[PDB]
Amino acid sequence: RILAPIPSPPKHPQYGHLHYLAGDAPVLNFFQLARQIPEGLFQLDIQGRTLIQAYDPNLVAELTDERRFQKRVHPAYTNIRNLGGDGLFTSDSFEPNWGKAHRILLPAFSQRAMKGYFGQMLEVAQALVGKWERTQGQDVRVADDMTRLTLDTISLSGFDYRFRSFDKDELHPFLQALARAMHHTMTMNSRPPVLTPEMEEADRAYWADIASMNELVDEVIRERRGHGGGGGDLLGLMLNATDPETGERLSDENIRYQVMTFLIAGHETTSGLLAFTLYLLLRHPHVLAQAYAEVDRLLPGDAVPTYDTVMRLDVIPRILDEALRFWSTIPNYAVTALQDEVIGGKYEIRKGQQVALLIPALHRHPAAWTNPDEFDIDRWTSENRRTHHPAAYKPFGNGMRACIGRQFALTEAKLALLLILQKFALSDPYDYHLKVKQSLTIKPEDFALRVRERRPHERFSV
Numbered sequence: 001r002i003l004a005p006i007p008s009p010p011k012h013p014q015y016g017h018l019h020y021l022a023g024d025a026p027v028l029n030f031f032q033l034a035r036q037i038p039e040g041l042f043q044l045d046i047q048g049r050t051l052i053q054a055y056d057p058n059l060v061a062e063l064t065d066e067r068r069f070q071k072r073v074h075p076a077y078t079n080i081r082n083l084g085g086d087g088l089f090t091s092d093s094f095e096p097n098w099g100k101a102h103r104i105l106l107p108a109f110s111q112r113a114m115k116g117y118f119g120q121m122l123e124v125a126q127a128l129v130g131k132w133e134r135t136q137g138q139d140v141r142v143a144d145d146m147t148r149l150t151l152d153t154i155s156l157s158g159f160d161y162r163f164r165s166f167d168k169d170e171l172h173p174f175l176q177a178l179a180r181a182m183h184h185t186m187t188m189n190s191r192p193p194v195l196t197p198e199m200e201e202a203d204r205a206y207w208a209d210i211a212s213m214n215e216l217v218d219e220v221i222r223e224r225r226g227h228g229g230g231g232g233d234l235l236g237l238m239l240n241a242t243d244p245e246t247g248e249r250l251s252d253e254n255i256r257y258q259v260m261t262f263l264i265a266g267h268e269t270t271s272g273l274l275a276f277t278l279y280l281l282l283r284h285p286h287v288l289a290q291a292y293a294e295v296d297r298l299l300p301g302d303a304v305p306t307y308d309t310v311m312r313l314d315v316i317p318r319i320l321d322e323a324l325r326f327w328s329t330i331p332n333y334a335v336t337a338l339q340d341e342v343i344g345g346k347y348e349i350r351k352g353q354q355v356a357l358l359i360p361a362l363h364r365h366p367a368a369w370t371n372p373d374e375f376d377i378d379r380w381t382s383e384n385r386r387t388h389h390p391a392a393y394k395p396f397g398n399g400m401r402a403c404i405g406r407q408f409a410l411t412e413a414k415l416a417l418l419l420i421l422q423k424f425a426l427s428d429p430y431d432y433h434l435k436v437k438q439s440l441t442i443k444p445e446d447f448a449l450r451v452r453e454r455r456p457h458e459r460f461s462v
């Protein structure tokens, strides 16, 4: 009926709105704007397109209705698809392989499946601890070692391959190719129309990198299809399992795509979560005290945890829940309007228009979070968790297109933190000033800490 124009900031005489896209992490510019605009959504003019940002909890509830808005590859995930293919992260819902992979892989990513992966997560976590034992007093490169942790973990659980990233500084070539390709993929989302001589060659090396990755994974696949067909890992499951709906197995191409997808979607989200958590614990040390108490309660001496240990945790899970409220590592994923829509009874969203969920602004909206800028893990007890706004906490996405890796991620992080705090006294020698970098994910950059073995008399409990 009587529509309202989506609010829009006044615009700059030289830059228009493009200055909001500048810097190491433009989602933070969007967050400051959101704090100026109480209507809960705003509009920017980016060269040709319209950019819309949404953070009001009720509006986001509307944008979360998969009858009205859905994730679409349409254009925003097109470059990342260069290496994701029609894997789960980079395929449209209507493509048959999405449904197939989804229904095949969900049981493999459920909570009751996590025990099957524990020994693998633990193998990698112990290697991290080993490195930190070996280098006490020297600078720990937190982001870097967390990326090692998560790459090795997802690689071992995904396709039983051990990159041994803590034995050496230099990463395995497969992972260097992954890193290069990921960086270049984000570069393609911008840059100018006419390509200079350096850029053409960079595209050639990019497609070459991708080929080298496809080759390694393909080789593992063929070469598992001869003898065998399943050694517990996710690949072994994708080799046998059929879709209970169509009766079909996944193609070999699509299996490789899923393996690539696990790596794309799993390492910098999870390593980001872990780095941000160590940052937050350094900045809220009473919380860190409570976590040390939990660790000493459950793992006295040099006791090695089981999956049961992880599931008996309380403080550390709630720490992670609140860290994801402050610093959710995919912070600006978007939905697309299926039809012309009207949200808030006021605001028109045309068919095909993207609306980004401004996760930091949503995760901190005063209408949904009391004292939103306060780090408080008691928000996440069973009792208080029940009273949250149902659309104001979306760190693992939404609906059918939600994170399938959530339980893997949270298990991995719980365990890493448990072992780290079991062994190490954390220390901040440089007064780390938080510097956030945005690519596919957000992440603390140039974050160094120091660790020292906890001595026996320094543990709690008797």
Ligand code: HEM
Pocket: 071, 088, 089, 102, 154, 261, 262, 265, 266, 267, 269, 270, 273, 324, 328, 329, 330, 333, 334, 394, 395, 396, 397, 398, 400, 401, 402, 403, 404, 405, 406, 408, 409
């Ligand atoms: C080993 C760890 C993980 C794996 C294997 C994984 C895997 C995936 C996959 C396959 C998807 C696409 C699901 C679909 O469309 O069917 C997905 C989506 C998503 N994941 Fe994860 N993930 C992991 C960790 C994380 C973490 C730690 C976060 C956030 C803190 C996260 C946030 C998300 C979000 C927001 C989406 C939706 C993305 C969108 O709407 O475009 N993931 N993940």
